[PDB]
Design a protein around this ligand. Structure first.
Ligand code: HEA
Ligand code: HEA
Ligand code: PEF
Ligand code: PEF
Ligand code: PEF
Ligand code: PEF
Ligand code: PEF
Ligand code: PEF
Ligand code: CA
Ligand code: CU
Ligand code: MG
Ligand code: ZN
Lengths: 121, 47, 113, 269, 102, 534, 59
């Protein structure tokens, strides 16, 4: 058989599916044609509307007590989280390391961040 | 790319598993660093 | 193998930013074609007559200076003027060729030593 | 997409570069260049072929570095939007550094012209130095540089619009235009009246115009490799940094030549 | 904006009443005492209540030890620990100086 | 292991290589300084048998080595390439092959500097390479060419690392980080990268004009030819004072961090510290001609330049007072980075006040090329760069090495370099104000007393350095042992005065910076998922 | 000639270093290595005559 070219984001499985077909004979290449790899993944994402490589700042809407901790996702088993308060910039920057086994407590505002791992390494 | 990491894999030299002592290389490095100007003074005074 | 492996968590792929991205691609292509045609208009109606009208005067002055250097070729060594103090100083001999000759050294014009 | 499939990628846009020897290779070439030229200036090497070989090794190491970077941008696809923004800003800062070198040369010129020395004769240009006339050859030079700028922006917008044969012809025409500039500059250096050793006028004149000549030879190489990469389909419609880099280099070199022309000729004479 | 003293008092009363385990009691007490003011005795009373509610003795001794290192005289410490005499008698915490007699 | 260090393309390996070359060349510069001070102990040729040329050669070797090969590689290269990708959460800095070519172009600059010292006579021109002394009529031979090529290779390294640093901290920040939410060391190395990028062109221009005068018969600076030597002074000092602010501003970054983490309270007005560092960086490029009040500038020009030089006393005063405001009211844990911060504060204020007395163009009549200016600059350079370097080392080396250092030896090393550096650099003001000229291998014999006490101080400083490179060995062979016994300081921040020990042990690192929650020696590629921030 | 897709396949499907992945890589890489070794051996070799004083003979 053969691999396809992953026309949208639900169809890509691997790095070899991100290659796509070339420009034909005398046209310029379009971005859809000859982009490969991570840039092609980012391009398919910008076409779908999904921003790959999430750049969202930390959820500082609530305080996050230990009965409902602030859940933060991680494709590893830990993350570095800098908390500054219950509003955005309430106190100084406080860097914490939530892991799988340990929640992270702020000690200046007392927020509790719970890792949830995505994983599958 | 995936290299080894840990307590002594961060550095170029080899400290623990070693035939010669580490003090040999560690003070020979700073000794030739300290003796480069003496080589310079010897050459210029021989001239 | 974890249960979180087959959970889709990219969000909704129906924001208007997707259609605005593709429409902005179409708009950049059309505006690029219009600006391209404007620049063939400028580069044909402006650049070519300027380069011809400058090349004609440049060829005439180039031939004039070629004639004047050709007359200056037949000049004896005693007739070349007084090289000044700051002119063609030799602090040390050059390491290319044989000594007193620069890179684009013209022996017809620059005769001084 | 899923979570298993999202787990197999970079999770951050920026390029994780593979290990490559070309930094230490270019460094060793640069050391051998400096050593061989400091030993051939003062007669410790007999001839210049050692310095020629060191320049050749430095050039081929730089070419192999650029071969690796066009490989990573084209075939490996590692240049996403963040890496493209980063290399665009990096080329902009290097261009600012070259502009500041030319500001240093303009400082040397303006000092040695606004303070005319008494050995020169308290006049600018000095007595006995007939200056290069502005209107004869450098007028042709500056109008073909301005038309080079118009030609690169026409070819760049023809590339964005999708038209291949217009963009290729534009890039070919502007490459031959700037080698006509290089040839006219060599012709001007060949039939000129003064030398680089003819005092400070010849000194700072040939220094400034020769450094700009060197940058235009560099732009000739960049326009040539950009023509090759556009011919062999490396450049897309929305993904090209070699081209945007080479045309902002073209425009900055055009502005530097405009200042060089107006000062060094229309104020020097 | 700067808080007046009674606004501070109301805020740390509310904070010590809402604290729910030992990390929160020690956190609230740490940034309670790290201002340029000795807290009002209602705040210390709420601190001793909140340290009792999380079942931890030695922080309720640390209330008085931090009050000693915080207050400016040796007489205002007496004014504090005689105005908290009934609270400290009810909970039964010692001072550190009458716990380690030296 | 050929790949990981020779073909290196991640920032931390480049950083420890930068630090190794920096400390090797710093050992060599300290040896040249010892030899200089040994020859300058008593009048008459003591050790160098006559041969003032060798003394001048060791003077430029010591100067160019300690500036361009110890402080600039250490501060910029090692600390930038370790923490600047880390303290913003970047994975690996943009253009890492430029990051590798800058390091690998440094030690060949060292190689050609050493061979400049070895060839026919040596460069004896001072660290400023003023013509016509450095021209071909006074210095024949290929030596000053090789010193010029050393300066060119380290100029390439500084500029390329500056480009790398600018686009790394601009483009590759983590997701929560606005530019206002940056640390002060990252801001400091950002501003330093901008001053490098805007200064090294004028240095490259003036140095290549010097080379063109020397070997290609042209006259930028030859009077017989119309050239003017003051043009080199203008170009070199337009590099030169931005250069010394480049050397001091990473110290202003490090000292904010060690002061805030050993006073357990944040920096007083951190955005004002960003504004003050940027104001110093902008105000450097406008004051460059205070180094040449003697050449015969116009009275209005000198009256400008003394005001422009004096204006920089205000933002440096804002920085030095905000550091006092950070240390005031906190809980001082006097570890050795805090000792180096306090000593930096006092001794850099002393050097800056002598510099303010040097800023006046009417007093620089009396102080130019005396030992008063070497008092000023060895004070600000030595304390504000070496104490910043030692504070950065004893601050970040447990984290970036995983090996704790002996603390008692660290405090005796600090104290020895404190009193030794004071004993060497305090009588230089007396020698200068009594009129001892600069760059002399011998003196009138009325200077012998203060030259003797300073030469006594040099041996104390070299003993503290030998002790420091013993602390390095003891850290490298017994670091885990130093963690397990009580020979070191495991926790940089003690518990607060309410905090239980187990409540501390669940939260054992409380920093406002990323680098201390990273694992000892950190992951070869950390930040798989990007570090989020509110 | 539009070798871009084919070279994407060759370059991504390769356990070789990036300068070796093209089929024409040795054609550049072997003479470059020899010429580089000569060009960095020789000016280092001319340093003893530099520090000894023996300039090059003009023959
Ligand atoms: C980086 C700046 C720097 C530093 C730190 C020093 C430090 C010293 N210098 Fe120097 N010096 C200069 C820069 C510096 N110098 C310059 C620019 C000149 C001008 C030349 C000219 O005018 O022509 C000069 C000239 C100069 C003179 C003037 C001579 C003259 O012109 O007549 C003297 C006089 O004694 C001197 C000696 C010393 C001594 C004994 C030290 C002692 O302080 C040595 C003790 C220092 C240490 C022991 C440092 C620790 C060692 C390390 C390796 C750091 C380790 C830490 C880490 C790696 C994190 N040097
Ligand atoms: C570490 C690098 C460094 C730094 C930071 C400085 C900082 C300053 N320097 Fe200096 N200097 C050098 C490195 C440095 N210098 C070198 C290497 C030379 C010799 C070069 C050579 O000869 O080759 C030199 C020489 C030099 C000269 C040339 C003299 C001469 O050659 O004849 C002058 C003249 O103006 C000068 C002045 C200053 C001033 C005003 C500051 C100011 O920036 C200092 C600012 C700090 C303070 C002012 C103190 C802190 C502020 C307060 C405590 C608030 C209260 C203060 C007031 C109200 C004033 N120094
Ligand atoms: C010098 C004598 C060596 C003798 C070797 C004998 C070999 C026999 C076998 C012995 C075992 C193998 C030995 C080889 C391994 C070796 O020692 O590393 C070899 C290297 C160089 O090697 P070379 O190329 O000169 O060796 C020629 C043969 N290949 O040394 C060194 O870098 C010494 C470095 C000194 C230590 C520096 C300390 C400061 C570090 C600070 C870091 C922290 C930074 C924090 C801030 C960012
Ligand atoms: C690091 C970056 C440094 C940046 C600052 C560089 C400033 C100097 C620029 C040098 C241009 C010299 C020139 O272009 O010289 C042009 C002259 C032209 O000959 P002529 O016109 O006199 O012929 C007489 C009749 N017309 O060639 C020469 O005579 C020889 C010049 C010296 C030999 C070449 C020196 C090359 C150094 C290049 C360094 C580039 C980096
Ligand atoms: C000395 C000789 C100088 C010759 C320069 C040739 C540059 C070509 C490199 C290239 O072409 O690099 C291509 C890349 C990106 O390519 P892309 O994404 O457009 O590929 C499209 C794939 N579909 O451009 C860059 O990263 C920036 C280029 C900066 C170059 C600066 C050169 C400075 C040299 C110092 C001297
Ligand atoms: C003189 C120095 C010239 C600097 C130009 C840098 C351009 C900006 C940039 O960053 O160009 C990007 C490349 C480095 O990219 P990379 O492969 O590290 O990046 C990987 C992610 N794309 O620059 C270069 O190839 C510089 C090549 C130097 C050649 C030798 C010069 C010796 C003098
Ligand atoms: C020229 C004088 C200044 C020189 C430079 C200062 C000295 C450098 C060292 C500073 C260390 C302390 C700083 C941290 C303190 C802090 O941050 O305090 C913070 C407090 C907060 O107050 P708040 O809660 O009411 O307001 C909250 C909202 N702002 O503000 C103060 O304390 C006010 C202090 C006023 C000082 C007035 C000085 C009067 C004397 C002037 C000189 C007179 C000389 C007379 C000689 C005979
Ligand atoms: C601080 C501690 C270290 C400082 C070193 C001081 C050097 C001593 C010196 O410089 O000694 C020079 C003087 C004068 O001796 P002299 O002029 O006869 O020298 C002629 C040749 N010997 O000897 C002493 O007075 C020794 C007593 C000095 C007391 C220092 C106490 C400091 C407290
Ligand atoms: Ca002496
Ligand atoms: Cu200065
Ligand atoms: Mg002077
Ligand atoms: Zn918080």
């Amino acid at each position: 058989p053969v691999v396809k070219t992953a026309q949208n984001l639900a169809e890509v499985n691997g790095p070899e599916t991100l290659i796509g077909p070339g420009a034909k004979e005398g046209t310029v290449p379009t971005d859809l044609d000859q982009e490969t790899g991570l840039a092609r993944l980012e391009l398919l994402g910008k076409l779908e509307g999904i921003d790959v490589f999430d750049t969202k700042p930390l959820d500082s809407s609530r305080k996050g007590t230990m009965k409902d901790p602030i859940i933060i996702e991680s494709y590893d088993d830990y993350r570095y989280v800098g908390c500054t308060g219950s509003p955005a910039g309430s106190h100084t920057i406080m860097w914490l390391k939530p892991t799988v086994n340990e929640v992270a407590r702020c000690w200046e505002c007392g927020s509790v961040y719970k890792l949830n791992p995505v994983g599958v390494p | 790319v995936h290299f080894k990491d840990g307590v002594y894999e961060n550095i170029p030299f080899k400290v623990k598993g070693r035939k010669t002592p580490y003090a040999l290389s560690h003070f020979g490095f700073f000794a030739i660093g300290f003796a480069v100007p003496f080589v310079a003074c010897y050459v210029q005074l021989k001239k | 193998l974890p249960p979180n492996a087959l959970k889709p968590a990219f969000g909704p792929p129906d924001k208007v930013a997707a259609q605005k991205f593709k429409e902005s691609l179409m708009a950049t292509e059309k505006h690029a074609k219009d600006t391209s045609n404007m620049w063939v208009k400028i580069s044909v109606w402006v650049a070519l007559p300027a380069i011809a009208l400058t090349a004609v005067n440049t060829y005439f002055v180039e031939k004039e200076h070629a004639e004047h250097r050709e007359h200056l070729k037949h000049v004896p060594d005693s007739e070349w003027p007084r090289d000044y103090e700051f002119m063609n100083i030799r602090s040390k001999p050059f390491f290319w060729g044989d000594g007193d000759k620069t890179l684009f050294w013209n022996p017809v014009v620059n005769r001084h030593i | 997409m899923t979570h298993l499939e999202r787990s197999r990628h970079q999770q951050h846009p920026f390029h994780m570069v593979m290990p490559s020897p070309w930094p230490i290779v270019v460094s060793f070439a640069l050391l051998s260049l400096a050593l061989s030229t400091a030993l051939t200036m003062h007669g410790y090497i007999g001839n210049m072929n050692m310095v020629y070989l060191a320049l050749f090794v430095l050039l081929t190491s730089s070419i192999l570095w650029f071969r690796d970077i066009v490989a990573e941008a084209t075939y490996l696809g590692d240049h996403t939007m963040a890496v493209r923004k980063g290399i665009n800003l990096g080329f902009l800062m290097f261009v600012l550094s070259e502009v500041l070198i030319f500001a240093g040369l303009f400082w040397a010129y303006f000092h040695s012209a606004m303070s005319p020395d008494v050995t020169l004769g308290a006049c600018w240009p000095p007595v006995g130095i007939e200056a290069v006339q502005p209107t004869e050859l450098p007028l042709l030079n500056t109008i073909i540089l301005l038309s080079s700028g118009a030609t690169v922006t026409y070819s760049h917008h023809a590339l964005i619009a999708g038209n291949r044969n217009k963009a290729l012809s534009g890039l070919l025409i502007t490459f031959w235009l700037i080698v006509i500039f290089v040839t006219c500059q060599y012709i001007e250096y060949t039939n000129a009246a003064f030398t680089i050793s003819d005092g400070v006028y010849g000194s700072v004149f040939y220094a400034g115009t020769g450094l700009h000549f060197l940058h235009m030879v560099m732009l000739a190489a960049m326009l040539g490799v950009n023509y090759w990469r556009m011919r062999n389909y490396h450049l897309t419609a929305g993904h090209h940094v070699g081209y945007e880099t080479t045309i902002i280099y073209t425009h900055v070199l055009d502005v530097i030549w405009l200042f060089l022309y107006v000062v060094f000729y229309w104020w020097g004479v | 904006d700067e808080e007046t003293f009674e606004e501070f008092t109301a805020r740390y009363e509310k904070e010590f009443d809402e604290a729910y385990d030992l990390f929160e009691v020690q956190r609230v007490l740490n940034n309670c005492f790290s201002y340029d003011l000795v807290p009002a005795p209602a705040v210390i009373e709420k601190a001793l209540r909140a340290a009792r509610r999380v079942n931890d003795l030695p922080t309720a001794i640390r209330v008085f030890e931090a009050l000693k290192y915080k207050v400016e005289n040796e007489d205002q410490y007496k004014a504090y620990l005689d105005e908290l005499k009934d609270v400290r008698q009810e909970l039964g915490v010692p001072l550190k100086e009458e716990l380690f007699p030296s | 292991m050929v790949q990981r260090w020779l073909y290196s393309t991640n920032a931390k390996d480049i950083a420890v290589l930068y630090f190794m070359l920096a400390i090797f060349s710093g050992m060599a510069g300290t040896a040249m300084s010892l030899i200089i001070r040994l020859e300058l102990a008593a009048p008459g040729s003591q050790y160098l048998h006559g041969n003032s040329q060798l003394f001048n050669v060791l003077v430029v070797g010591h100067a160019v080595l300690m500036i361009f090969f110890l402080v600039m590689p250490a501060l910029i290269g090692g600390f930038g390439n370790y923490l600047l990708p880390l303290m913003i959460g970047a994975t690996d800095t943009a253009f890492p092959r430029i990051n590798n070519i800058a390091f690998w172009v440094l030690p060949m600059g060292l190689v050609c500097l050493v061979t400049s010292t070895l060839v026919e006579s040596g460069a004896g021109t001072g660290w400023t390479v003023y013509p016509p002394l450095s021209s071909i009529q006074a210095h024949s031979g290929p030596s000053v060419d090789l010193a010029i090529f050393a300066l060119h290779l380290t100029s390439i390294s500084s500029l390329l690392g500056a480009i790398n640093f600018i686009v790394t901290t601009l483009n590759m920040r983590t997701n929560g980080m606005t530019m206002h939410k940056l640390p002060l060391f990252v801001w400091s190395i950002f501003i330093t990268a901008f001053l490098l990028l805007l200064s090294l062109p004028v240095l490259s221009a003036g140095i290549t004009m010097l080379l063109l005068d020397r070997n290609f018969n042209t006259s930028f600076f030859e009077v017989s030819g119309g050239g003017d030597p003051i043009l080199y002074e203008h170009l070199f000092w337009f590099f030169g004072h931005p250069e010394v602010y480049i050397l001091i501003i990473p110290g202003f970054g490090i000292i904010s961090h060690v002061v805030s983490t050993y006073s357990k309270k944040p920096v007083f007005g951190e955005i004002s510290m960003v504004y003050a560092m940027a104001s110093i960086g902008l105000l450097g490029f406008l004051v460059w001609s205070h180094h040449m009040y003697i050449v015969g500038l116009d009275a209005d020009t000198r009256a400008y330049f003394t005001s422009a030089t004096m204006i920089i006393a205000i933002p440096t005063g804002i920085k030095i007072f905000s550091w006092l405001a950070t240390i005031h009211g906190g809980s001082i844990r006097l570890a050795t980075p805090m000792l180096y911060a306090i000593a930096f504060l006092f001794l850099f204020t002393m050097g800056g006040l002598t510099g303010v007395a040097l800023a006046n163009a009417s007093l620089d009549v009396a102080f130019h090329d005396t030992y008063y200016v070497v008092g000023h600059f060895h004070y600000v350079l030595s304390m504000g760069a070496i104490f910043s370097l030692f504070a950065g080392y004893y601050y970040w080396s447990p984290q970036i090495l995983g090996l704790n250092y002996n603390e008692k030896l660290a405090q005796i090393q600090f104290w020895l370099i404190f009193i030794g550096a004071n004993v060497i650099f305090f009588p230089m003001h007396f020698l200068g104000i009594n009129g001892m000229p600069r760059r002399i291998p011998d003196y009138p014999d009325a200077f012998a007393g203060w030259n003797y006490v300073a030469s006594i101080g040099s041996f104390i400083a070299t003993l503290s350095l030998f002790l420091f490179i013993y602390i390095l060995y003891d850290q490298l062979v017994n670091g885990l042992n130093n963690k397990v016994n009580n020979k070191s300081v495991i926790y940089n921040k003690a518990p607060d005065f309410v905090e239980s020990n187990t409540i501390f042990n669940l939260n054992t690192v409380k920093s406002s910076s990323i680098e201390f929650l990273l694992t000892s020696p950190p992951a070869v590629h950390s930040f798989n998922t990007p570090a989020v921030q509110s | 000639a539009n070798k871009v897709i084919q070279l994407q396949k060759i370059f991504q499907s390769s356990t070789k270093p990036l300068w070796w992945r093209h089929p024409r890589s040795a054609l550049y890489l072997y003479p470059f290595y020899a010429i580089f070794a000569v060009a960095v051996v020789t000016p280092l070799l001319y340093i003893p005559n530099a520090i000894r004083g023996i300039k090059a003979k003009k023959a």
